[PDB]
Design a protein around this nucleic acid. Structure first.
Length: 63
DNA sequence: GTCACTACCGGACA
DNA sequence: GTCCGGTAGTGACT
């Protein structure tokens, strides 16, 4: 629901004209912050893929 | 047009 | 990091 490694933050406004409104943003696994679906969708175009190699997996028990 | 609502991004903050 | 505002966009409509 929130993709693996990402974080979702929800906040509610307290004062002023827009009191009660909500703001949502996402933090990526590298700490990039996205406050809009538009900017996140732009980023995702070339940067949405994650890849894996055999070297990412440790099958050994240390001495 | 107005009204109500959503969405995006900017600036203030010291 | 915190916080709300200004602006543009959508869509129904007495």
């Amino acid at each position: 629901p929130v993709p693996c490694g990402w974080e979702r933050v929800v906040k509610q406004r307290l004062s002023g004209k827009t009191a009660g409104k909500f703001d949502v943003y996402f933090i990526s696994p590298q700490g990039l912050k996205f406050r809009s679906k538009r900017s996140l969708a732009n980023y995702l175009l070339k940067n949405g893929e994650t890849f894996l190699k055999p070297e990412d997996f440790n099958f050994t028990v240390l001495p």
